Amino acid sequence: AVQQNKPTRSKRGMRRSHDALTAVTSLSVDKTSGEKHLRHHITADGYYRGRKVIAK
C-alpha cells in the first residue's frame, strides 16, 4: 500500500494527461428566438423548437 519511492512530477503530469475535460463542441440556434442553447434542451428563456414551452 505504501510507496517505495515518491512519484516524480513528470509521472504526476502524465497521469493528469487524461484529466482535461471536453470543451463545448458547438451550440444550436433556436428557430424563433435565435438564442444559443444546448442541443435538445430548452432555452434559458423557455423556448424550444419555436414554441414557448414554459412560462418565463
Binding site: 475535460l21 470543451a23 463545448v24 444559443k36 444546448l38
Partner: peptide, 19 residues
Amino acid sequence: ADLIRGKKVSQALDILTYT
C-alpha cells in the same frame, strides 16, 4: 482554464456557460 485558452472571447463565454 485550459478549455478557453486562445479562443475568441465570444466562443469562450459559450464554452464556460455550458461547463
